[model samples]
Target chain A: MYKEPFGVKVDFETGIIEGAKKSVRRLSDMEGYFVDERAWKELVEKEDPVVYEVYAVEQEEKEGDLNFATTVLYPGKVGKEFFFTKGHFHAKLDRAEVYVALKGKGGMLLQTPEGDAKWISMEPGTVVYVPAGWAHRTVNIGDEPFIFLAIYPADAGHDYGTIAEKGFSKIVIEENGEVKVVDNPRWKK
Target chain B: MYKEPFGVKVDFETGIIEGAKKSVRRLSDMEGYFVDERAWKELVEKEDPVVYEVYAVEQEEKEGDLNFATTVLYPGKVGKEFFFTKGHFHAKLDRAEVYVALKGKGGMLLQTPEGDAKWISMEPGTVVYVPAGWAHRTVNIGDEPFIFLAIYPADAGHDYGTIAEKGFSKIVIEENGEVKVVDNPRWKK
Candidate 1:
């Protein structure tokens, strides 16, 4: 999967990528990842809005190659919870990932199967380092979309199943116009 | 070596990195790299200005790891030539690199041993990709530091000696208030 070198233009705030492939995740794609079942059901009856999407460009799945993606998490609420992506860990457990915040504001929810959990604020120019073994999810807490660029190893295939089955250890929510973090009742040990 | 994961705060305009190792290159450090020997001598007689510096943080040197660097090339003219980095290819020849411009203005000077020479403009939100086997240097042309974030494979060691010996195929200069590209008279095959 060798590709020619080229420059890519990014509209940071708009989350635009010149030659990236676009992919979207609606409520149907998320399935059971969210905690608010009633709210999720209600939203689906009204409309299945795009929760998030990614624009990515990758060269190859080899040792020397890289994969880049611009991820946009739409800002909205399902019940008391904020919108988030279906979290994932890397198949190569020790593979680290980096995220550079381009626009809006959010918080990163990071967890490890070994019981470690962490959260960090993300704003424009903030670079988040998701250490090896940590599963990561971005929750949008601002009025606009939370947009960031992710740079990681090309061979670190995503392990979404593990996170989907076990779920995150914590959940982010909005309570009376305030952001809050609470234990996820749906988390499976 | 293996290291713990952490978030790094970056001052986009200032190129201030929270947890990065700082290294500088003054005139003394860039011995035979610059084309303007007269200007280099003239400036050193009065003062040894910091030409450029890099703030970097890297984890283990292996397949799944990544190294991050925030490079700041100070704006100044050395005779008719602009300031730049000591370009180099990865020791692992096929390793690629990604540079995301954070602040100021500059251009990337890229060359391959196969005789491919290219240049690209760098500004905020611009992401330049240097494919396998390309040596790259950053030349600052703005009034402030040309800042950018470089993310690449941790195991891809820098082979600076090759570029230092052979030299870039082209050099960037400022001719009559305009940025220009011309052949490096000193470049050797």
Candidate 2:
């Protein structure tokens, strides 16, 4: 049983949850996911800073355990596109998820299998609920790192292959100093 | 199915979750539970402002559904004792609960059925995991209202009677300008 005290310390300024060992996902992890290949190559060649980090703590119960995680998406751009997560649908297609924005600003993009998409603005104190049957991803649109808490059922295994194959239909980007959502040409319906 | 948009706006300053209708529990709800009977009566006679308010949003699912709630505990003193909840165990003995502090300062008092007790400090950004089989009550120790987010399994029904009958062995109070935990004379082993 993961019974080592029940409190996780959170640092708001640095977006660090102490005692949570930082595991990172670099730019090279999802090679074909980014919109711009040349920009991704340049960023990877110039020291591959971590694109995102996740600190997760799971309950020990066997039957109905829920998983809690803090995700930090580093603020940066990939050829006008903002930093984002490799979104996914749940393997158990009926499971839902909740996200609480702890720091910074972002957008939660939810898309259905039929290509319908919705964007929800996120900031500190905002709570977003992703219902069942929707694929979800988050994009950091601000200058600072975006950090938030994700709570979901332990059995809601992630199916990243669907998102990897079809990709999100709309992507958030910074265009001429404005945040905008534009159509993704790489998206396959 | 609670298909209503899965987003709840939070106002940290006022401890109000926008779009949530405030439901309250007053001192009169659980009579004779306070440390001082006379003080409780005096407080009850004066308009009986709510001791706590709950803003809850539940997901629609049969098993393993997650419920999210924001609890605001108003600050006050009753004969040297701080305002607190009538703690309770889960009806389904093995259900766990998680609490994330959003505002103010407080203490989370946890007591086992065998009378063993523990206290965890609470403040903004603090997350407390209340393991299965323990009854928990929260106290507002600061001058301002204490606000926190509580997430638990949908089926973990509350059994406040367990604590109402036995009471906790220890009681937290303000003694000589400091918080103190002392034996509860009324506690029945």
Name the best candidate (by TM-score).
1
Look at candidate 1 and tell me the lDDT of residue B26: 86
Instruction: Enumerate residue pairs that collide in model 1.
Output: none
The candidate that achieves the highest DockQ relative to the unseen native structure: 1
Residues A20-136 of candidate 2 have per-residue lDDT tens digits of: 778789988868888898999999999777889988877543555567788999898888899999899888766677888878989798888887888999998888888777889
Q: lDDT tens digits, residues B44-74, model 1?
A: 7788788899988777687767888899999
- lDDT per residue (tens digit) for residues B15-117 in model 2: 6777878888998885877779899888889867688988888755456567788889999888878888888988876667788888898989887788888
Number of clashing residue pairs in every model?
A: 0, 0
True contacts kept of each: 0.61, 0.37
User: What is the C-alpha lDDT profile of model 1 across A1-189, one tens digit per residue?
Assistant: 334567788888789798677799897777787788888988978998999989998866876678788989999888888999998889887688889998898979998876467888999888888887888899999889999999987778889998878889899999888998888888756
Report the backbone clash tally of model 2. 0
Cα lDDT listed for each candidate: 0.85, 0.81
**Distance from true location, Cα of B136 in model 1, Å:** 1.2
